[PDB]
Amino acid sequence: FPFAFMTLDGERAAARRYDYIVVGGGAAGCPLAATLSTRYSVLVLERGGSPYGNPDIQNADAYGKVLLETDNYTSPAQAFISEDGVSSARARVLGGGTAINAGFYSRASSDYVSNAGWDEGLVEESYEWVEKQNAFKPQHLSPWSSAIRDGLVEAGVLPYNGYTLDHLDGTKISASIFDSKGKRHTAADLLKSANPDNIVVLLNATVSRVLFNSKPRASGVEFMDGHGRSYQVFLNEKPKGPEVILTAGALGSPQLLLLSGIGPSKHLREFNIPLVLDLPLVGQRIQDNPIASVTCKSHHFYYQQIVGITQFSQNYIEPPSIFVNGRNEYNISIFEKLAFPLSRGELRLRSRDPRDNPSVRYNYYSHPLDFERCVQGVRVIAQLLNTPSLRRSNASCFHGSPINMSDDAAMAQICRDTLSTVWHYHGGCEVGYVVNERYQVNGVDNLRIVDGSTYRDSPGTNPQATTMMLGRYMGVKILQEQA
Numbered sequence: 001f002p003f004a005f006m007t008l009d010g011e012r013a014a015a016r017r018y019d020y021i022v023v024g025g026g027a028a029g030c031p032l033a034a035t036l037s038t039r040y041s042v043l044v045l046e047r048g049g050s051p052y053g054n055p056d057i058q059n060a061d062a063y064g065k066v067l068l069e070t071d072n073y074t075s076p077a078q079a080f081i082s083e084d085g086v087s088s089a090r091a092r093v094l095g096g097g098t099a100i101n102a103g104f105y106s107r108a109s110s111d112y113v114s115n116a117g118w119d120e121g122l123v124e125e126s127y128e129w130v131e132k133q134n135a136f137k138p139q140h141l142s143p144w145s146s147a148i149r150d151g152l153v154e155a156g157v158l159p160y161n162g163y164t165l166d167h168l169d170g171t172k173i174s175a176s177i178f179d180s181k182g183k184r185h186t187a188a189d190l191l192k193s194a195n196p197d198n199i200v201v202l203l204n205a206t207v208s209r210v211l212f213n214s215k216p217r218a219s220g221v222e223f224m225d226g227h228g229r230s231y232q233v234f235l236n237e238k239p240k241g242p243e244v245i246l247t248a249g250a251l252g253s254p255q256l257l258l259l260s261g262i263g264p265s266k267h268l269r270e271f272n273i274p275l276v277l278d279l280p281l282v283g284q285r286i287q288d289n290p291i292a293s294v295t296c297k298s299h300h301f302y303y304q305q306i307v308g309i310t311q312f313s314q315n316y317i318e319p320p321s322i323f324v325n326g327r328n329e330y331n332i333s334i335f336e337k338l339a340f341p342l343s344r345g346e347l348r349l350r351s352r353d354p355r356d357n358p359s360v361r362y363n364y365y366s367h368p369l370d371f372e373r374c375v376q377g378v379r380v381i382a383q384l385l386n387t388p389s390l391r392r393s394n395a396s397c398f399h400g401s402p403i404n405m406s407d408d409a410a411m412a413q414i415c416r417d418t419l420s421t422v423w424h425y426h427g428g429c430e431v432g433y434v435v436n437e438r439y440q441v442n443g444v445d446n447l448r449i450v451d452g453s454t455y456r457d458s459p460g461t462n463p464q465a466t467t468m469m470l471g472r473y474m475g476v477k478i479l480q481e482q483a
């Protein structure tokens with residue numbers, strides 16, 4: 001453990017009270033807790049272990065290995081499958097998704113920031129604060145990246161924007177949380193500027209419910225340690241005073257609300273959970289962004305550098321590598337991601353065990369506009385593969401496999417046959433539905449939710465930049481509302 005305030009001692013952690021209890025030490029949770037700790041006492045409860053000293057996390061070229069080695073309760077990735085049949089995974093380790101993701105770093109658009117109603121200046125400062133710790137501008141493009149960039153330009157995904165963090169229509173190079181030595185910088189590194197006298201980071205602590213005082217007012221949380229012991233830990237008894245803040249992710253935060261008795265009464269009744277607040281929209285309107293792709297096998301890992309943002313920001317073209325087998329075997333893909341799907345579904349409990357997955361149903365391509373936009377995206381992949389740049393590329397493994405540029409039926413077939421997540425699932429505690437613009441749960445005091453469960457739309461081409469940013473931003477806003 002590189003930070004002295006990281007601990008496994010749940011008894012000792014729960015014997016103290018805290019100004020803030022942050023549930024989930026992930027992409028939003030780490031910078032949030034670090035920021036709060038500069039002035040106030042903070043406990044972070046993280047269900048998983050430490051990312052440090054784990055080669056499968058530190059090494060960029062191990063990206064995807066963890067996804068093949070999941071277990072029920074302990075592994076740093078936890079597999080799940082949506083009710084639609086689409087396999088996926090979520091992090092279970094300090095650092096959250098940043099410990100297991102493809103590392104790609106790209107900011108939300110100015111339109112997104114405007115729609116979210118965030119303060120522009122603070123958003124910019126908050127991104128900068130994360131970037132100076134965890135974001136890296138590539139020194140050199142791989143041969144694969146060079147070909148994809150050249151090809152996207154030749155395919156008319158314009159303008160060419162060079163390297164930029166910003167979300168602009170056209171083709172660009174962007175940053176990564178992988179450094180020039182191929183080492184991953186997870187959100188847990190954002191704990192570096194925490195005040196070590198004020199923060200406690202308890203690992204292997206699965207939070208099972210928010211507790212309320214005898215509007216309901218949150219008073220603390222209960223968590224289960226790895227040894228089957230559950231402990232309660234409490235808040236330190238127009239500024240709001242102490243608060244519980246959920247940063248347990250798109251799946252974790254709605255699940256925890258439900259387990260806490262905050263949700264649709266009928267569903268809570270089914271699981272014999274005492275009602276605290278009937279909040280029907282908890283776990284509603286959730287969404288995942290589907291990809292369609294072509295894939296080939298390679299012995300080379302090329303980390304993500306390039307993204308094509310198609311006209312109207314409608315589809316995102318990216319060319320990932322992922323570990324498939326132990327030089328190692330990798331799958332290289334070109335995907336199109338549907339940027340702004342209409343299709344939505346719902347999250348529900350499957351059990352009262354706080355370690356289990358909730359059920360999630362995404363209704364992929366239930367709205368036909370989404371399926372047509374998939375075909376629109378695949379049309380671009382087909383043009384990309386036809387470019388002189390892709391055809392000449394010695395790095396590409398696609399020389400075998402053409403897509404007929406003028407056969408929409410065949411592209412619709414690719415949409416169906418390759419339907420997958422790219423792990424951008426979000427919603428379930430949505431701003432304007434479950435929380436307000438200050439991330440406060442509607443109808444409850446001293447309870448906030450600041451993570452991907454709050455998003456209507458996935459920010460940027462890939463969301464981790466905005467999620468880390470938001471944790472830092474809300475940290476600052478909370479500090480600020482104290483004068």
Ligand SMILES: Cc1cc2nc3c(=O)[nH]c(=O)nc-3n(C[C@H](O)[C@H](O)[C@H](O)COP(=O)(O)OP(=O)(O)OC[C@H]3O[C@@H](n4cnc5c(N)ncnc54)[C@H](O)[C@@H]3O)c2cc1C
Pocket residue numbers: 023024025026027028029045046047048089090091092093094095096097098100101102103104105106205206207208247248249250252253256354422423424451452453462463464465467
């Ligand atoms: C395989 C994969 C690849 C990805 N690739 C990229 C990419 O290249 N670029 C990009 O921008 N985004 C990428 N993402 C997405 C990005 O990583 C996530 O959207 C982001 O991490 C979400 O942040 P969060 O804080 O909402 O949740 P998380 O980062 O998942 O953090 C939630 C944390 O809460 C913990 N937790 C959950 N429930 C509880 C509980 N009850 N008690 C205690 N702790 C709990 C979890 O263990 C976790 O650490 C990827 C995701 C995955 C899974």
Ligand SMILES: *[C@@H]1O[C@H](CO)[C@@H](O)[C@H](O)[C@H]1NC(C)=O
Pocket residue numbers: 071072073
């Ligand atoms: C995980 O689930 C499987 C079947 O559901 C079972 O074999 C296994 O013992 C479970 N528990 C643990 C702690 O691994």
Ligand SMILES: *[C@@H]1O[C@H](CO)[C@@H](O)[C@H](O)[C@H]1NC(C)=O
Pocket residue numbers: 047048049073074075204225226227
């Ligand atoms: C949590 O602790 C239990 C008991 O020590 C252990 O078996 C388990 O692997 C731990 N889980 C994590 C995430 O480290």
Ligand SMILES: *[C@@H]1O[C@H](CO)[C@@H](O)[C@H](O)[C@H]1NC(C)=O
Pocket residue numbers: 295296322323324331
């Ligand atoms: C790798 O790609 C092949 C071909 O599409 C696919 O069948 C396989 O599931 C992929 N493997 C992994 C682990 O992603």
Ligand SMILES: *[C@@H]1O[C@H](CO)[C@@H](O)[C@H](O)[C@H]1NC(C)=O
Pocket residue numbers: 325326
């Ligand atoms: C995959 O696994 C082993 C090591 O785990 C690797 O050495 C070998 O190339 C692979 N075997 C096949 C053909 O799947």
Ligand code: NA
Pocket residue numbers: 157158159169170310311312
């Ligand atoms: Na354009």
Ligand code: NA
Pocket residue numbers: 338340341342369370373
């Ligand atoms: Na759409």
Ligand code: NA
Pocket residue numbers: 107108109112167458459460461
């Ligand atoms: Na955006």
